[PDB]
Subunit: 251 residues, 4 copies
């Protein structure tokens, strides 16, 4: 019962890590708000969890007015917010020469503005509960990739905003951390050519992709009392990916 | 002259480190495009430099339409672009709880969008000259501050965009690097109280604020042949600030 | 019990975070080997734990002959090794100009050699259990201090040895990670003056020193199944210390 | 004449980067001490440089008594030391399971003790000239490699000792920085199988190995007045290697 009666708001709750986060927190006694643009996935997850202990909601995290209303209505209806998981995301592939101003606006709106807005509007509620924030960043926020320029800029914004907010609020009893996953098994990635999955298994020392549960576990730890002295941290959940200096594996 | 007949585009060239960069590159033979939204300031710097070797451009770098036009106009008139200094920036002080959505739009528009747009629209021209980009990020992009949340997110994006674009374009002969200053003596920090400045002399092991010329020296180095194997680097120009683990002096 | 019948070897187990780790793992069902060169201290901790579930080993971990023997003796008697906590450490204060070659030999022998030897001689046993290593490094290994030069070099080695061994062994089912505390309330720092401790409450955003139990909590997490995809990570347990760019508070 | 009449002591002066460093500094007016275990290479380089402006000397940098005598004799004979280049090195290949205690002693003696000892004994001389230190670290000190455990520990010690010493001495006017090269063209590496050199050209965005001159250039910059505000920095000279989060290049 690590999260007994704690109110956990999950943005991007309809993706693999979002759903694994929702089930892990629920299993540990949390009341879970599954917030997402899309309705089907979060409605199905919410319906699968204990009645009265899960609600699905529509949100555009790129919309600060909608975000502010969502955060106040959750606090009004459930009386508290204890945990924010900023798990919404969009990915676009390409260099800045292969990706449009529009692509940049899309990445920035969800991957940066979403973290800024949901953290700003949850914080007054988190300050009352001495709750915490866990951002879903990425190894792509700790270092660059080939062919994901906008994505790397945005997750780099999330990684450093995590540090800055942690300094601003940690002394008022609200810890702010991120998880920085590498390759996570979804149907997107299960479908990838074998040649591509092999290149990931070579660069990742554990030699496999993460299960979404393996990332949700770290999110749950970082929201737990055991993480009482972890603040402003960007935890690589990457089987060793970012532990390399970038030099090739030779035997 | 290290920069003899090289076209150097410098955003935020009307003041501080941009101005110091304009004088240093001009002294070393560069033709300098001075871009700024402070029309009088940038006109004065432009006019102070050798006739026919400097042109002022009145531009808000947050405007992708204006930026695209400037980069193509410069290329047409001067026949080339060798160096982009993404130096234009604005600061705002406070946590996300003390700074408005409008403060965020101002920070993100100049400090992220301006870097993204100027990089994107210069790059086709830099690919022809095998030129380079030097972003002015900040130590505020390599880690967090207390009370500059939006600025830290923005410079966070600049730091990781520097890495990603370096991976994308280095193989095509275009190096992308940043300088990451700590306290520099400019209009951006001239209002900051004495007790904060005194704490900077403690946290910076060199025991003083930087002169703008000291950062312009590193921008010139990073645009030089001597930096031919430096790519995707965020060079701290901070007198040791980021070298510290954040702990106070042990003795 | 998360660690039911797991053999956990803990260096520096007679005091501070090693002791707290011994109690936490023991509480969670571990059989604990308590290694220390403080024979009375480690005997007292060992004797305080459940009978037949703890053994004290009087060892100087800087001694590769003694370390090789302990690791093989433990494996013989207990039939397995599941977890190594490389926690033993000594501190010395000063620049290289104020600390002797003998100070360096003491720092390097315990703080680097001891980690290297214990890791090397445990690893054949951890490969059989698909166990893990948790190094106790320091924020003093992720960046510099004023006046702990030798200690910073040593913890520097621990941090990057953690990354390299993670790449070497993660694919064989052995995860290698560190915890990087800042100020923790132990014998190592109990002599440090009040003015320095007060500065720590400023530089640590949580505004307090860590309890040893708060670091032992993260060691237990990193040795747990919930850390199944964390490998080669240097987890800061520093209340935000390393999240800062080193600058003093901006407001 | 950037280094006119400045006394530059280069350890490891007989290797590719050592010789390129010696020629670059000499070209800029330096008086160069070429210090190395081996005699032939440094004698030949010294004999090739202006008479009265270069001397070759034997040193074991693993020997603190010999190092201390060398530093005092250079200061006695030439009257000053302005620059230390800590460029001595030994590499060993393998995990900790493939490399002996002896291998560790060899790596630690030259790659750590050499930097500690030469910096300790030069410093009193550098404090009189407000000179500087440039450590030859490695990307292998900024992150791990597969199959170089001891090497990664040692260069990780050099990277963090650089930070610590920079904090200790930068306020007394002695800046301390490192260069962190990746693959550098030598005959060792020119001879490598094409399959291995291809894997380096893939991970390095510039798509090639560094010339030793490209690393020497960065050493010369970091010792120059242009680097007046760079202190405690570990400059990647790696064509982008460490700019990657470790994820594979996919197209
Ligand atoms: N001063 C410091 O201590 C410090 C520290 C770290 C980094 N920086 C960065 O250094 C860069 C230069 O700032 P500075 O300290 O020289 O300040 P400054 O005020 O002296 O100069 C900044 C210049 O940028 C221009 N500018 C701002 N927004 C613009 C826009 N939208 N379009 C065009 N021009 C614009 C301003 O008019 C001004 O001339 C910024 O990116 C800043 O964030 C400053
Ligand atoms: N949207 C825009 O077009 C826009 C927005 C911001 C500012 N600007 C331009 O910036 C310029 C200044 O406007 P502002 O409101 O930012 O300015 P301001 O009056 O706030 O002054 C800007 C900075 O200059 C410093 N300063 C004052 N006197 C100075 C002097 N003699 N020399 C150098 N620095 C001096 C101030 O202390 C301050 O740090 C104008 O040209 C304005 O058009 C453009
Ligand atoms: N206390 C802090 O603020 C702090 C901060 C960061 C990291 N650390 C690290 O935490 C670890 C634990 O230290 P602590 O703070 O719990 O101190 P402590 O003094 O409470 O415990 C350290 C223990 O290690 C033992 N030890 C030392 N050298 C040994 C050797 N050669 N062989 C065997 N045992 C040996 C000591 O006898 C002692 O029991 C160390 O590696 C230390 O560097 C301490
Ligand atoms: N070469 C070796 O074998 C070696 C070297 C160092 C110490 N040790 C062992 O460490 C132990 C202590 O020796 P030392 O000289 O390091 O000790 P010490 O007298 O310096 O005390 C060690 C630490 O314990 C603290 N302390 C004092 N009273 C305490 C108490 N009642 N409970 C808990 N902590 C207390 C002290 O303030 C100090 O921080 C001995 O068992 C000694 O054999 C081993
Ligand atoms: N504007 C938005 N507001 C709220 N949630 C959003 C928004 N944009 C994307 N999301 C959600 O973020 C989650 C993560 O997106 P993504 O990383 O693309 O997941 P997946 O790869 O599994 O499709 C999704 O559930 C998606 O619907
Ligand atoms: N104990 C030592 N004292 C002084 N110089 C040393 C010592 N050990 C190695 N060196 C020198 O360090 C330099 C760099 O070594 P290394 O990296 O192996 O160079 P290379 O790969 O070109 O042979 C060499 O010139 C070598 O002789």
């Amino acid at each position: 019962g690590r999260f007994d009666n704690k109110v956990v708001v999950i943005t991007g709750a309809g993706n693999g890590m979002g759903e694994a986060a929702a089930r892990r927190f629920s299993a540990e006694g949390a009341i879970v708000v599954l917030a997402d643009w899309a309705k089907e996935a979060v409605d199905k997850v919410a319906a699968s969890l204990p009645k009265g202990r899960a609600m699905a909601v529509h949100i555009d995290v790129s919309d600060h007015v909608a975000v502010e209303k969502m955060m106040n209505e959750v606090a009004e209806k459930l009386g508290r917010i204890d945990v924010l998981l900023n798990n919404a995301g969009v990915h676009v592939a390409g260099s800045v020469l292969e990706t449009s101003i529009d692509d940049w606006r899309r990445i920035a709106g969800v991957d940066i503005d979403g973290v800024v807005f949901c953290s700003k509007f949850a914080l007054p509620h988190l300050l009352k509960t001495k709750g915490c924030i866990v951002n879903t960043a990425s190894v792509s926020g700790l270092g660059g990739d080939w062919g994901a320029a906008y994505y790397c800029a945005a997750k780099g914004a999330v990684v450093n905003l995590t540090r800055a907010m942690a300094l601003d609020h940690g002394g008022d009893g609200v810890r702010i951390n991120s998880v920085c996953p590498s390759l996570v098994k979804t149907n997107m990635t299960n479908g990838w050519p074998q040649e591509i999955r092999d290149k990931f298994n070579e660069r990742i020392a554990l030699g496999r992709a993460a299960e979404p549960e393996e990332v949700a576990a770290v999110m749950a730890f970082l929201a737990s009392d055991d993480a009482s002295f972890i603040n402003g941290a960007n935890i690589p959940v990457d089987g060793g990916a970012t532990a390399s200096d970038g030099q090739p594996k030779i035997v």
